[PDB]
Amino acid sequence: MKPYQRQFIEFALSKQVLKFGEFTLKSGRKSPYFFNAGLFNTGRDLALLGRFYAEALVDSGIEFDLLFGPAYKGIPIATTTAVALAEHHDLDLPYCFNRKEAGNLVGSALQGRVMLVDDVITAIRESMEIIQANGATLAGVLISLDRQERGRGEISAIQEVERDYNCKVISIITLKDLIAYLEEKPEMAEHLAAVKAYREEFGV
Amino acid sequence: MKPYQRQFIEFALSKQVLKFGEFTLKSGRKSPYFFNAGLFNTGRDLALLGRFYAEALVDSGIEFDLLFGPAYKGIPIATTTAVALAEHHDLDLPYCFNRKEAGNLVGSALQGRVMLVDDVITAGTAIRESMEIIQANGATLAGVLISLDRQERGRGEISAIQEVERDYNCKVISIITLKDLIAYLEEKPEMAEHLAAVKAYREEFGV
């Protein structure tokens, strides 16, 4: 994997954003790992989070004119990603985010090719409606982890977003990266087996 | 003024946040200048803005445990200020913000001495909302930090910042004040007409 992907995994583990064990997802599915970015809740966590998103954006090669953060979780993420692009990649991007009621936008004018940044896709439909109503284009959606598993139907929730809004979704890391990481850790052999078994049953 | 205050004024001028001209405020007053912090609307703007807030906070000497940003405009301000404190001041601070309606909170637990950060303020429903949340959670308000204190009368005899302070016995600090804008305009011949207009406005409305 790329260095920023390895570092993001280690960062998430250290803050217990990423945890391996026996969990139940929103759906009710039994899952061998959990990812919850809410525990990125200090200035240092925010600083690093923005650098990871910024590195994933530059790595993707996608062209975009504006960074959009969905209310509410997307607002700090877009802010720190925009800072990191300016400080560490010499890229000065307009940013924008929505209010859930009234206009309904904060930041730069919503125009051009829009990169949406958010924590996960299991807020997004609401922000997509705003981007379309303003006549802007979707350059992409960047989230932290692509779990690469079926949603309620046969395709993943990410694939459903891609289909419904004709946009590419990219991620900082994927389930494949988690598995590659766990292969290097002998003490995590038990978790690796459980993750591979989960992928066999629910993976796409 | 301190160097970071002069640099903040230069920054606001460069991004058209600070404009000298003819304007009408929300109160109908006719002002010789306007300050619209919403025009700090790019990543580089956000990066620098956080660094100026962080410098004003450290320079204040006020001790605090958590940064709170009121929804919505305070959320990016608290975020970039927290980033700047961690990256440029070796200070790793919890942050928190509210959701406007179902208080409903995002981030670290709301407790300890809270520094509220926003772009501007005024005694009213918005600020009273943030303060009730802070007190409801059993936290202490260490202060409020804003970008510019216009130092002009509200509808009473005190300024909007004094209203917030005197009505709620809290400390408000600012990156710059009207006094600093006047000091910046001095001995710049190309701004002489604006200096006189600002000074005239202050004589009429300044507190």
Q: In whole angstroms, what is the distance from residue A193 CA to residue A32 CA? A: 10
Query: Which strands, in side-by-side order, build the sheet including B105-107?
Result: B105-107, B95-98, B66-69, B113-117, B140-149, B172-177
Q: Where are the alpha helices (DSSP H) in chain A?
A: 3-14, 43-60, 74-89, 124-133, 157-165, 175-183, 189-202
Per-residue b or e along B153-175, where b marks 16 or more CB atoms closer than 10 Å to that residue's CB? bbeeebbbbbbbbeeeebebbbb
Q: In whole angstroms, what is the distance from residue A110 CA to residue B76 CA? A: 17
Computed on alpha carbons and rounded to an integer, the radius of gyration of chain A in Å comes to 17
Could you report how far apart the first and last alpha carbons of chain B are, in Å? 19
CA dihedral B109, B115, B119, B120 (to 10 degrees): 120
Return the residue of A nearest to B96 by Cα. A41
Q: In whole angstroms, what is the distance from residue B185 CA to residue B33 CA? A: 12
| Residue A137 and residue A110 in contact, taking contact as beta carbons nearer than 8 Å | no
> How is domain A1-204 classified at the architecture level of CATH?
3-Layer(aba) Sandwich (3.40)
Asked if A79's CB is within 8 angstroms of B46's CB, the reply is yes
Annotated binding site of A for orotate: 34-35, 122, 147
Nearest to B31 by CA among B167, B164, B153, B186: B153
Backbone torsion region of residue A28, taken as left when φ is above 0, otherwise alpha when ψ lies between -120 and 50, otherwise beta: left
Burial (CB < 10 A; 0-12, 13-18, 19+), residue A188, is: middle
Q: Where are the alpha helices (DSSP H) in chain B?
A: 3-14, 43-60, 74-88, 125-136, 160-168, 178-185, 192-205
Q: In whole angstroms, what is the distance from residue A18 CA to residue A52 CA? A: 15
The count of other CB atoms within 10 Å of the CB of residue B16 is 11
Provide φ and ψ at B173, rounded to 5°. Answer: -120, 165
| Residue B115 and residue B61 in contact, taking contact as beta carbons nearer than 8 Å | no
Residue B171, marked binder: no
**Exposure of B146 in the CB half-sphere (CA atoms within 13 A):** 22
- Contact partners, residue A46, CB within 8 Å, separation at least 6: A40, A76, A80, B79, B82, B83, B86, B95
Distance from CA of B53 to the nearest CA of A (A): 14
Q: In whole angstroms, what is the distance from residue B81 CA to residue B63 CA? A: 15
| Residue A53 and residue A29 in contact, taking contact as beta carbons nearer than 8 Å | no
Q: In whole angstroms, what is the distance from residue B17 CA to residue B36 CA? A: 5
Burial (CB < 10 A; 0-12, 13-18, 19+), residue A56, is: buried
Q: Which residues of A touch B80 (CB under 8 A)?
A: 79-80, 83
Give the residue extent of every domain in chain B: 1-207
Return the residue of A nearest to B73 by Cα. A106
Asked if B95's CB is within 8 angstroms of A42's CB, the reply is yes
CATH level 3 topology of B1-207 = Rossmann fold (3.40.50)
Asked if A41's CB is within 8 angstroms of B107's CB, the reply is yes
Could you report how far apart the first and last alpha carbons of chain A are, in Å? 20
Q: Which residues of A touch B50 (CB under 8 A)?
A: 83
Helix H or strand E segment including B31: strand B30-35
Give which of A57, A80, A108, A119 to mutate to test B binding, by max B Cβ within 10 Å.
Answer: A80
Residues in chain B: 207
CB-nearest to B80 from A41, A79, A96 is A79
CA dihedral B55, B56, B60, B62 (to 10 degrees): -80
